[PDB]
């Protein structure tokens, strides 16, 4: 039998929803008659690398790595050092670019922020995710680029560092309100923080969306059911997983590495978003 | 280093988020590698998953079964010297190899806490009826009523599917037929239910009190904040990983620990 190996970091948040990604990977492997193995990549570059080798030494025939910590170059070196088909999710490779399936998180963020600016929002708050996360880093970069491209000055008092948890959302908002710098819209780097933030705003008697419009990322199942319904950036996780797993199985059947279908999210517009007052 | 193998069918890869995070974290705090295999869609495939991991030289196995029966699981246990344990299922012979929560009892106790606070007409939204947890929560609800001794009304009960959309749909159904509290089988459903109540302009908790099960991270941040039954998932994972490694470390098996849920009262509930 052929086995597909998955390596995924033990982080509380994942930019590509983990149970969703695992579900579609498992389903795809099952339908194509492959066994699936997932190894804990744990929580550092070194352990992500060791988990890849571990799976090979279990005779996995192909590997999908979803790494938080390994640098692009480290990933390219891994791919080159091995004969088995190895592909990377959520990171864009420099040398082995056909081995990546990636979503331009920076662009998605730029797009959500640009939408706020074109709806009339000049003073936009931003809640970051953890600073060790590529996805968090890209979203923040897309926020700063959207401001700078629209001739809006960057003010770090409008950026609150968060940790992907609802609590960090509520606390990030309380911190921004105490800072006193005015804002008409808030972009949270995931839905959990956006929900925490809507709570703290409601508690402080700040109307959403009337006084502050809110956007998250992830488009979680509860987003249409928050009060008010949460506008959110949807990532094509399912598509992305079917691509990388489908390609890895293609390789095992004699396929070759063809150029990348790249991906982008879409902002889903719900009641938490409107023009300023 | 030693490896702990985890067999979980993909039909459960939708609580699962928690288990994976916590099993991995707890394996790393103890210096072990976690490896997971997919139990797929049959007793034979779950069995084969376990054997697969063993033949890859995992040192101990945890399974979260869907298809394999306990008779079947007890026999797998007897046929292997490697520690093999089961999460969320009660074993008959090797009960010490089991980590399980009495979902029917904690459901009972939560609904009872509603009765004692003054509720008499209590609505109930089920999870998917192929899930034992779903069965047991319904069961615990019907027991608390019958025993209080409020008489079961099948009009106060709707079928859900564990999703927020199904919670809203369930409430929509219920509204086209009188209750002061609503019990949702998970938070996700509770949240969709509160959305449908708000949409209809039914006041929560003033008109309808709402509780869920799971106590998810977002619960305190909903509007109103969601009252929920906290299951000790983290503690149960710590227990199963801890016990396996105890076996590996040379220790031995022990009578199973009892885990109970607890109702956390928030703004979405009153007496
Ligand atoms: O989808 C979430 C629900 O599904 C299950 O994983 C299987 O019954 C439950 O443990 C959980 O409450
Ligand atoms: Na994280």
UniProtKB/Swiss-Prot annotation, chain A:
The keyword Cell cycle does not apply. The keyword Repeat does not apply. It comes from Escherichia coli (strain K12). GO terms for molecular function: DNA-binding transcription factor activity; sequence-specific DNA binding; transcription cis-regulatory region binding. GO terms for biological process: DNA-templated transcription; negative regulation of DNA-templated transcription; regulation of DNA-templated transcription. Repressor of the asc operon. The cryptic operon is activated by the insertion of IS186 into the ascG gene. Keywords: DNA-binding, Repressor, Transcription, Transcription regulation. This is HTH-type transcriptional regulator AscG. The gene is ascG. It comes from the Bacteria.
